[PDB]
Design a protein around this ligand. Structure first.
Ligand SMILES: N[C@H](CCC(=O)N[C@@H](CS)C(=O)NCC(=O)O)C(=O)O
Ligand SMILES: N[C@H](CCC(=O)N[C@@H](CS)C(=O)NCC(=O)O)C(=O)O
Lengths: 201, 201
């Protein structure tokens, strides 16, 4: 399978999950500004929404949307925690966390709009604080990872999102559970492998 | 199961799917402004995110997020189209459309922010047009419903979203596939039943 990505963007979550699944996969960096694949082709032909991630499962079949991609990868892995049975409450919990990651993403994405006024930015920041506060309340000191004992796809997604906060030099020290979750995720060898594959430290 | 909703909001999609599944269910209207249940209790205890929908599967187990709720309902129905096998490409397509419905929702939701300046509103409207253009391109004249021959959860979700456009007196006539999809969905007896249950025509 071939993952269309941009370094450090939300495609990093499926990149991580592909690495964790042990998945043979390939990687295609996308010029997101010009909407071009690496060979100069039109990325809109791959994803008409023009966003990453996209995952070519096989020639002619490209899945878009992080929730769909993350669960496709999981459902075709041998990692039981990545593929709970539909819906066992576990599947519902998996999808709820992924759904909430999309709420988190929507909040952070305002930060990256062009010609963002200071006033508009303040509103974005307040929303980010609110979403991060909600994430922190959702996480529990009783669980090693978001959903419990096992690392799952929303752990990778949450960690990338929190990563955008760090990269924007935002103070996340009031969200210690979220920071600890990301610390745990980044320590994983197959996570470090994915980072390395995007030329990231 | 008990669905927490607000009349006409995104909770209408799971309301519809509950009706279509034949599901026995109950309904709890939420004062979204004050974040209160009907008995005056604190809605944040039901959904700490403070949003609808939420679905009590049983006492003590409340699922939030439309993608999770819509698939939980489907997976516990007898409607095969609502529960493709994980991931058969059909499951991935289901989740991709639901993921995109969340992109659509995020665009429309800007329209309902308080103290929305005209200038800010123009930006929201341009995003809505872009998301609707993407939806229209995703739909195919070869398919009776979004994903093919069968009505599925994203049909209900898309129809509610387009409904917000109508209610805001927005011109959607440039999206004939989207309008036809909504027309088809609204004609369904179990959809009309759900509308009736929220006191809607
Ligand atoms: N609903 C999301 C949307 C993905 C998205 O907005 N991705 C961003 C990168 S994090 C993007 O490619 N934006 C388009 C752009 O930056 O030009 C999903 O889960 O796939
Ligand atoms: N990620 C969404 C978020 C749901 C959402 O934002 N719902 C709106 C209603 S359409 C809401 O209850 N907003 C809170 C409010 O209006 O105070 C989901 O799929 O459940």
């Amino acid at each position: 399978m071939k993952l269309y990505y941009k370094v450090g963007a939300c495609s990093l979550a499926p990149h991580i999950i592909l690495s964790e699944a042990g998945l043979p996969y390939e990687l295609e960096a996308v010029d997101l500004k010009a909407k071009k694949t690496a060979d100069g082709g039109d990325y809109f032909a791959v994803n008409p929404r023009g966003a990453v991630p996209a995952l070519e499962v096989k020639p002619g079949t490209v899945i878009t949307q992080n929730a769909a991609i993350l669960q496709y990868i999981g459902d075709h892995s041998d990692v039981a925690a990545f593929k709970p049975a539909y819906g066992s409450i576990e599947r519902a919990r998996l999808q709820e966390a992924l759904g909430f990651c999309s709420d988190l993403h929507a909040a952070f994405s305002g930060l990256f709009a062009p010609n963002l006024s200071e006033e508009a930015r303040a509103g974005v920041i307040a929303n980010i604080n609110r979403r991060l506060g909600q994430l922190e309340a959702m996480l529990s000191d009783k669980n090693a990872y978001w959903l419990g004992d096992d690392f799952t796809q929303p752990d990778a997604y949450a960690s990338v999102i929190i990563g955008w906060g760090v990269g924007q030099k935002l103070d996340l020290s009031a969200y210690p559970k979220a920071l600890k979750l990301r610390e745990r995720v980044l320590a994983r060898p197959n996570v470090q492998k994915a980072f390395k594959e995007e030329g990231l430290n």
